[PDB]
C-alpha cells in the first residue's frame, strides 16, 4: 500500500514533522489518515492530524467519520499496518505499537 503523503513528501521532511510533535507534545500523536487503495468509499479532504494520544480508537473513528464524505449508513474500517485496531485501544497505544520510521502513525480506512 502507498500513502500519497509518502509520495508528496521526502522522508527527511516527514521525520522532522513527526519528531518535532513527539518532543513538544507529549499528549498528542501525529497521524496520517488516507483511504486504502482498493477501498470503495467516500473521500476525506484532509490527511494530516494532530491527535490527543488519550482518545480511544473508537472516539477517533467518530471524529474522523464526521469529516468523510459518506453516505449516512456507510461504515468504515481502520487498518494500521494491515491490522484492524481494537476500538478500546488509545491512539497513544496504537502509536507506540505501529508508528513508522518517520515517526508518523498511518491509518488507512476502507469500506471493507
Amino acid at each position: 500500500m502507498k500513502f500519497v503523503y509518502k509520495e508528496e513528501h521526502p522522508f527527511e521532511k516527514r521525520r522532522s514533522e513527526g519528531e518535532k510533535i513527539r518532543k513538544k507534545y507529549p499528549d498528542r500523536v501525529p497521524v496520517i489518515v488516507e483511504k486504502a487503495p482498493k477501498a470503495r468509499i467516500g473521500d476525506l479532504d484532509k490527511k494530516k492530524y494532530l491527535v490527543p494520544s488519550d482518545l480511544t480508537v473508537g472516539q477517533f473513528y467518530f471524529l474522523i467519520r464526521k469529516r468523510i464524505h459518506l453516505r449516512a449508513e456507510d461504515a468504515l474500517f481502520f487498518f494500521v499496518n494491515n491490522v484492524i485496531p481494537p476500538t478500546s485501544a488509545t491512539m497513544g497505544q496504537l502509536y507506540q505499537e505501529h508508528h513508522e520510521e518517520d515517526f508518523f502513525l498511518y491509518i488507512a480506512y476502507s469500506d471493507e
Binding site: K46, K48, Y49, L50, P52, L63
Partner: peptide, 15 residues
Amino acid sequence: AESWETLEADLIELS
C-alpha cells in the same frame, strides 16, 4: 509545510 488538523473544536462532542 502541510497544515495540521487538530480536532480541538471536536472534543466538546465527546463529553
